[PDB]
Amino acid sequence: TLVEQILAEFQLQEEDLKKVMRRMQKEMDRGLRLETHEEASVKMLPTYVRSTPEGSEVGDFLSLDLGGTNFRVMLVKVGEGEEGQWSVKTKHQMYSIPEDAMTGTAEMLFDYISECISDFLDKHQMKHKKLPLGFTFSFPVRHEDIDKGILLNWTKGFKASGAEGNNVVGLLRDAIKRRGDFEMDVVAMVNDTVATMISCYYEDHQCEVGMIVGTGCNACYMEEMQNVELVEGDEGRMCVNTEWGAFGDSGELDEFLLEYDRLVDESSANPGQQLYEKLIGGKYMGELVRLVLLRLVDENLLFHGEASEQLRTRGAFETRFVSQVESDTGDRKQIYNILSTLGLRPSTTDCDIVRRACESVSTRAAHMCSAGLAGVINRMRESRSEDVMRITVGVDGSVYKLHPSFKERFHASVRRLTPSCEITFIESEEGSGRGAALVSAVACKKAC
Ligand SMILES: Cn1ccnc1Sc1cc(C(=O)Nc2nccs2)c(N)cc1F
Numbered sequence: 001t002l003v004e005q006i007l008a009e010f011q012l013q014e015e016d017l018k019k020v021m022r023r024m025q026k027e028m029d030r031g032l033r034l035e036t037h038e039e040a041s042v043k044m045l046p047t048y049v050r051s052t053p054e055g056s057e058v059g060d061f062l063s064l065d066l067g068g069t070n071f072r073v074m075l076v077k078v079g080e081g082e083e084g085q086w087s088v089k090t091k092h093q094m095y096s097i098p099e100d101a102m103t104g105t106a107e108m109l110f111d112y113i114s115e116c117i118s119d120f121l122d123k124h125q126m127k128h129k130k131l132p133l134g135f136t137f138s139f140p141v142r143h144e145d146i147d148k149g150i151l152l153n154w155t156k157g158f159k160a161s162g163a164e165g166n167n168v169v170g171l172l173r174d175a176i177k178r179r180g181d182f183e184m185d186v187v188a189m190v191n192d193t194v195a196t197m198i199s200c201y202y203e204d205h206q207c208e209v210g211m212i213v214g215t216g217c218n219a220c221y222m223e224e225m226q227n228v229e230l231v232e233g234d235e236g237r238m239c240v241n242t243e244w245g246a247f248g249d250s251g252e253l254d255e256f257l258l259e260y261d262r263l264v265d266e267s268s269a270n271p272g273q274q275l276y277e278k279l280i281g282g283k284y285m286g287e288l289v290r291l292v293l294l295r296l297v298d299e300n301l302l303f304h305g306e307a308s309e310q311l312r313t314r315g316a317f318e319t320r321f322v323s324q325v326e327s328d329t330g331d332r333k334q335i336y337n338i339l340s341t342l343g344l345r346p347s348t349t350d351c352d353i354v355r356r357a358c359e360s361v362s363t364r365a366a367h368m369c370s371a372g373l374a375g376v377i378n379r380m381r382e383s384r385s386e387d388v389m390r391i392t393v394g395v396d397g398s399v400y401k402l403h404p405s406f407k408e409r410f411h412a413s414v415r416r417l418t419p420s421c422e423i424t425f426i427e428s429e430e431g432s433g434r435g436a437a438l439v440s441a442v443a444c445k446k447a448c
Pocket residue numbers: 048049050051052053146197198201202205207208209222239438439440442443
């Protein structure tokens with residue numbers, strides 16, 4: 001119980017969740033209003049992706065995806081189905097993100113990107129073509145239009161100087177031209193939430209929400225134009241990028257933050273920012289467990305109070321370890337191997353204890369995240385005149401898709417918080433690639 005008392009600090013009662021939920025809805029409202037959009041922790045960034053303005057140009061598009069620690073480039077074919085347009089990835093390629101490409105400059109960053117876009121073109125005998133380019137850029141961006149927007153700031157660790165504040169599309173072209181080797185036509189730039197939402201739409205027209213729970217955590221949803229005061233017009237609907245990862249950045253979550261959270265935040269590449277996300281995202285989950293394990297050792301409750309060399313090094317406990325630990329069938333073989341690799345020799349009780357630490361940290365991520373989505377869905381519920389609101393949520397991300405029970409816990413908690421709502425969850429198959437392309441196909445009936 002001494003150990004369970006420490007782990008109990010991660011618990012969240014239903015009331016705590018309803019409180020986080022109400023606060024999220026309140027910050028969402030603040031991010032939308034002209035008078036509070038500037039100081040709002042939840043930016044509610046207009047994406048310019050508007051309510052299905054029929055008219056799609058078919059053909060083959062190129063989709064770029066930057067956000068994860070693995071830059072991807074792919075070709076997707078957009079055609080005309082019954083429901084709407086169909087889409088499919090035909091060719092793809094992944095390029096790891098180099099060191100000097102991160103510490104360097106925004107200039108270099110996109111320089112290397114062009115090198116990858118080219119390589120992809122050569123290796124697929126296609127460098128001799130000019131096609132529409134859909135760019136999935138997973139970061140907070142203030143758009144002026146579907147093909148123009150500036151980077152507010154980096155998240156998830158990226159830190160290329162000379163990026164924040166400039167037209168991201170601009171940087172892309174600026175580098176694509178330092179090549180001549182090829183020429184693309186950037187028709188649209190979207191956030192990964194938006195790409196996932198769009199791709200699921202054609203599968204289920206009721207999907208009006210996109211959510212990511214992977215390295216980072218965020219969501220987007222369809223808003224009524226009259227509520228998007230940062231964009232002239234009251235007619236139609238536009239998708240908004242909440243960037244709820246920064247929820248709590250103005251102290252909204254102060255009463256829930258634990259010592260491990262303050263520690264993770266203080267050593268992060270962005271101290272004081274993305275606090276809500278630091279409670280959920282796979283970029284921080286393993287690190288949280290590591291800190292919890294370290295306190296347990298200093299309390300002399302784990303590993304005989306003797307921490308390994310590796311255990312004391314940041315990022316050693318990878319988020320994938322958390323997921324594997326929770327997949328252990330009960331024979332503790334999985335847990336032992338993982339801890340043995342980190343230079344430890346755990347007992348049966350040490351293993352069970354690491355298991356509990358993981359479940360506490362991941363279970364809190366699931367519930368904390370559920371409050372956010374519940375806030376989004378209930379906010380939308382106010383503008384939905386009907387007994388039972390049926391809505392679909394498009395989801396992607398390693399934490400949500402691969403963690404043994406995150407998904408399950410998350411679903412049950414979200415439903416508990418959304419009375420009068422019938423929520424359907426769908427996972428995207430190449431949500432980003434196909435999403436970016438599908439949006440380029442519509443916006444391309446204006447730029448092409
Ligand atoms: C998600 N949802 C539901 C109703 N309307 C929407 S948004 C939506 C938007 C687009 C789309 O490409 N919109 C664009 N607006 C401006 C430029 S491209 C699409 N191709 C499909 C969609 F479903």
